[PDB]
Design a protein around this ligand. Structure first.
Ligand SMILES: CN1CCC[C@H]1CCn1cc(C2=C(c3c[nH]c4ccccc34)C(=O)NC2=O)c2ccccc21
Ligand SMILES: *SCCCC(=O)N1CCN(c2cccc(Cl)c2)CC1
Length: 277
């Protein structure tokens, strides 16, 4: 079969724009199927030496086949642009819901954290480090299950510094992320869901980094006791001592944390998600 062409689609609303691309809701006309198409401007990426970001993106997404990840279905191109055909997540970003609801109750925090843990287990088992995990790239599909995206910045085990709020100490100081770096980000995300704000906050990127490296943060008075404990076991400076990391014997003991007491891990992706708080 021939590669798809722009003419095969009716391009609809722009979902969002990044520094090097536009993600656009599009309908494949022949089958009426909706896709999020990521449109990349070749010149801009050429001129900014970002191409590796582009192949890693295509490569990593092509090997993702798990319910909690965005999938890459096709790729085509013209002179101007590169087009990635992606899963469309109708309900947008986890971030949107944090803003809208303010903070999640325990039921919701527990459910979504569990889906994120399950997704990271899959990813890490494939030797992939996300390196930029944040509510902005944890999407929600029509059934309100999560779909993680944004893989151009991932590391595959075969100079980058992710978003300041969620970046790990080892990436800052050692210039090297590891699987465990994503568990640090998970800690930050759990904290954000419960508190409504991320744990390392300050007036600029430099000051946020300083807090990260010194592990300087506080828990508000609203914080669920079991979530407090879990976060403290994720936000640990030493990457080999985080609950869930390989050196701490993996995902077993993480999933056994009592914060997850009432969760059924088996077919999480088939369970009905709790209505957002
Ligand atoms: C900050 N950004 C620049 C452009 C996208 C956005 C980051 C979050 N994000 C969302 C993405 C996706 C989708 C989006 C759903 N609602 C959105 C609103 C703005 C931007 C993207 C989306 C999607 O349906 N499938 C996706 O893969 C996506 C796909 C690749 C890389 C990053 C992505
Ligand atoms: S759609 C199939 C994409 C194949 C691929 O991996 N490519 C194609 C050429 N590429 C490229 C050309 C010009 C500018 C940029 Cl940023 C990328 C990417 C590699």
């Amino acid at each position: 079969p021939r590669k798809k062409r722009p003419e095969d689609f009716k391009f609809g609303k722009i979902l969002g724009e990044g520094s090097f691309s536009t993600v656009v809701l599009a309908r494949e006309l022949a089958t009426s199927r909706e896709y999020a198409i990521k449109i990349l401007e070749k010149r801009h990426i050429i001129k900014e030496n970002k191409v590796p970001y582009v192949t890693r993106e295509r490569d990593v997404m092509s090997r993702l086949d798990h319910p909690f990840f965005v999938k890459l279905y096709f790729c085509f191109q013209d002179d101007e642009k590169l087009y990635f055909g992606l899963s469309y997540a109708k309900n947008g970003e986890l971030l949107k819901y944090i803003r809208k609801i303010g903070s999640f109750d325990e039921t919701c925090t527990r459910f979504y954290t569990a889906e994120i843990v399950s997704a990271l287990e899959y990813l890490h088992g494939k030797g992939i480090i996300h390196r930029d995990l944040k509510p902005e790239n944890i999407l929600l599909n029509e059934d309100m299950h999560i779909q993680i995206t944004d893989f151009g910045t991932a590391k595959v085990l075969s100079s980058f510094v992710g978003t300041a709020q969620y970046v790990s100490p080892e990436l800052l100081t050692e210039k090297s992320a590891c699987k465990s770096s994503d568990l640090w980000a998970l800690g930050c995300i759990i904290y954000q869901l419960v508190a409504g704000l991320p744990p390392f906050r300050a007036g600029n990127e430099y000051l946020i980094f300083q807090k990260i490296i010194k592990l300087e943060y506080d828990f508000p008075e609203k914080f669920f006791p079991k979530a407090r404990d879990l976060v403290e076991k994720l936000l640990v400076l030493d990457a080999t001592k985080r609950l869930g990391c390989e050196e701490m014997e993996g995902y077993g003991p993480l999933k056994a944390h009592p914060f997850f007491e009432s969760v059924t891990w088996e077919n999480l992706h088939q369970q009905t998600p709790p209505k957002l708080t």
